[PDB]
Amino acid sequence: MFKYKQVIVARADLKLSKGKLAAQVAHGAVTAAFEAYKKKREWFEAWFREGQKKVVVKVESEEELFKLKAEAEKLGLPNALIRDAGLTEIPPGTVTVLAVGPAPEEIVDKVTGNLKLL
Amino acid sequence: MFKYKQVIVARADLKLSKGKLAAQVAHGAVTAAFEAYKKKREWFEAWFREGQKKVVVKVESEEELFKLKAEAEKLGLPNALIRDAGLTEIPPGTVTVLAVGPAPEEIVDKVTGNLKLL
Ligand code: NA
Ligand code: NA
């Protein structure tokens, strides 16, 4: 009776235009979805046919994305920290979003439950 | 020497909040990515390791998404027309975005090249 979800944490301090931010969120969702597909197949499958729920939250620094990624790693959650070579309006290698999940909602919330909604 | 990309067409007439629109764009990207993975594996693989380029464009009606989906189908392009049962702020079954690709840029552009950027 587990519910599954993916939470994408987007940086709101990069002054990115909406189309670019949406693209970054999509990079995170796709990348983490494939991470789950290959190493947590059951979680991926359940999520994918139960609405593939996604919630977009935000942070105001690059540092918070790294700390959240570390927490996701420590809990064994599929995740993807995104950088985009094509996003030249920000410095090369700058991370834009962190996608966490798909995974059981209660586990994902341990990492992202207190983040604020975009 | 083919370049690959995925274009996600989002409806800008639904008055959706940014977090929800980004989530819908992500649904499209993930769904179409898996469509390509299963029926155009080569296109998916190239795209996925070459930056998985995504561009977000918009339309102002549900009707345009259907016409674009038909065009994508006629050109044999992986695509995903999205509806979200959890998006209750709009009528049930309402389509929100159409993701086209990954596929060679020149083919994708035949469908989305004249759409305006979000
Ligand atoms: Na660019
Ligand atoms: Na909802």
From Swiss-Prot, chains A, B:
It comes from Pyrococcus horikoshii (strain ATCC 700860 / DSM 12428 / JCM 9974 / NBRC 100139 / OT-3). It is found in: Cytoplasm. Keywords: Cytoplasm, Hydrolase. Its EC number is 3.1.1.29. The natural substrate for this enzyme may be peptidyl-tRNAs which drop off the ribosome during protein synthesis. This is Peptidyl-tRNA hydrolase. CDD domains: PTH2. PANTHER family: PEPTIDYL-TRNA HYDROLASE 2, PEPTIDYL-TRNA HYDROLASE 2, MITOCHONDRIAL. It catalyses: an N-acyl-L-alpha-aminoacyl-tRNA + H2O = an N-acyl-L-amino acid + a tRNA + H(+). GO terms for biological process: translation. Its main location: cytoplasm. The keyword Cytoplasm applies. Belongs to the PTH2 family. GO terms for cellular component: cytosol. GO terms for molecular function: peptidyl-tRNA hydrolase activity. It comes from the Archaea. The gene is pth.
